[PDB]
Ligand binder design. Sequence first.
Ligand SMILES: [Zn+2]
Ligand SMILES: [Zn+2]
Length: 55
Amino acid sequence: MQRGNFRNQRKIIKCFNCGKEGHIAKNCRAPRKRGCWKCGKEGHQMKDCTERQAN
Ligand SMILES: [Zn+2]
Ligand SMILES: [Zn+2]
C-alpha cells in the first residue's frame, strides 16, 4: 500500500573506526586501555590517584 514517509534505513550499529558497536565514528574516543598509568595499576584512575591521604 504505497511507500513514503520513510526509507532512511542504514542502522549504524557498528563503528567504522574501532569496529565496536554502540557509537558512531564521529563520536569515537575509542578506548585507550590503561587504568592508572601514573602508577601503572588498573585498580584506579589518575583523576582519583593520590595513593591515599584520608580526609
Ligand atoms: Zn568507535
Ligand atoms: Zn595510580
